[PDB]
Amino acid sequence: MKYAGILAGGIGSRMGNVPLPKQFLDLDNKPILIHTLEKFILINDFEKIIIATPQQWMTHTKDTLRKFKISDERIEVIQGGSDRNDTIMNIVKHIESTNGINDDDVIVTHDAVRPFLTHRIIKENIQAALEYGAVDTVIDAIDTIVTSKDNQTIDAIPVRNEMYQGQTPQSFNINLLKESYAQLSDEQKSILSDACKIIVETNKPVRLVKGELYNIKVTTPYDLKVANAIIRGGIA
Template identity: 40%
Template sequence: MNVAVILAGGHGTRMGIIDKPKQFIDVYGKPILIHTLEIFDANLDIDAIAVVCLDDWHEDLSIWLRKYELNKVKWIVRGGKTRQESVRNAIEVIKTSCNGDDIVIIHDAARPLVSNRIIKENIELAKKYGAVDTVIPTTDTIIRSKDGNKIFDVPVRRELYLGQTPQSFKYSIILEAHDKAVKDGILDATDDCQLVLNCNKDVYIVEGEKLNFKITTMDDLLLLKAIIKLGKIGEI
């Protein structure tokens, strides 16, 4: 079984919008979260979906799931105080339905342009290797500074990638990684692959896409609207 875990438990404070988190912002008649869920619901490789959601939005989400007939969503999971806690909550909720070799595809709700190719390769390579991350090569030189005032070093660009989601794992591996993190006192990790690496397991790479960007700022939101509008025009 392939289970998508969609993370919609954040507050999105960097957007500067105070009345709602970014994943619930309306874009052409539906929330960003629903745009993302529709991709996974329609994907033939996805068997079930768990949505990690802020408590105050569970009722709204339930209404949207019925309205847009998103039938693969089997669990609405309580969001945690941190990303790590949110993911762990989902892992615990789906435990009774998963065996060790089932694949868990963890994806940000605020990346609504993820392609079916990325999802497919995540599943295929996670089955083969156990753990994968979606990344794209950086096209810019990365500058490292320790104090924000002066350059500390300039890493070799060909060795650097920008992380995206999905991050996908065999269920047994992601469960072990989160159990070990809690045991080791790690409670606020922002990346599941780092937790897997802490278990001395390899994480392999899936090639991402520039369009699989995360909605973080108003500029990102404007770009998303433009891309969706162009797509609609292309369908006419």
């Protein structure tokens, strides 16, 4: 079975890591969250489409689904966790207690504020997770990537042809994901912020699915201006 996990944990402020509900901001007179959800509703293959969000935003999430006539019976809103990977595992636990996990189940996890993913990206994620167990959506780095350990001087400039910008979806065989997460210590779980890095750290392969330049994360006013441009131009 194929599950969707929409991660609506908000975008944390620089000072204090306060999560802000950027997914509720308006994009062409409709919240970003709704644009993203509409993309997943068009995929008939999902058994459930689960939005995980902080307790304090659950009521408003349901209200927004109602206001925009989102009635699909597959949609469910659950409480998120202490961090993004913990929230993914809250989704996994909900699946296990609700349907029970099948050996071939896969989950497609995706940022609520990435509304411009495409049918191709989702189908390719599903197929790669079914075949290989773990998938990351990426685009080739176009800018040069530089590293620094002090925010003052360059440490290294890696070979650009090997560098990629990570996007989402990130998709997994569910049992594989559970086993990988179970191998990590609490410390490892505290520092790790990316879901595919769980898999890499437990020494299992992660496939690449190519995303799109316009599969942007809408988190700043600049990003909202670009997102409005993307919509008006029919780009995505």
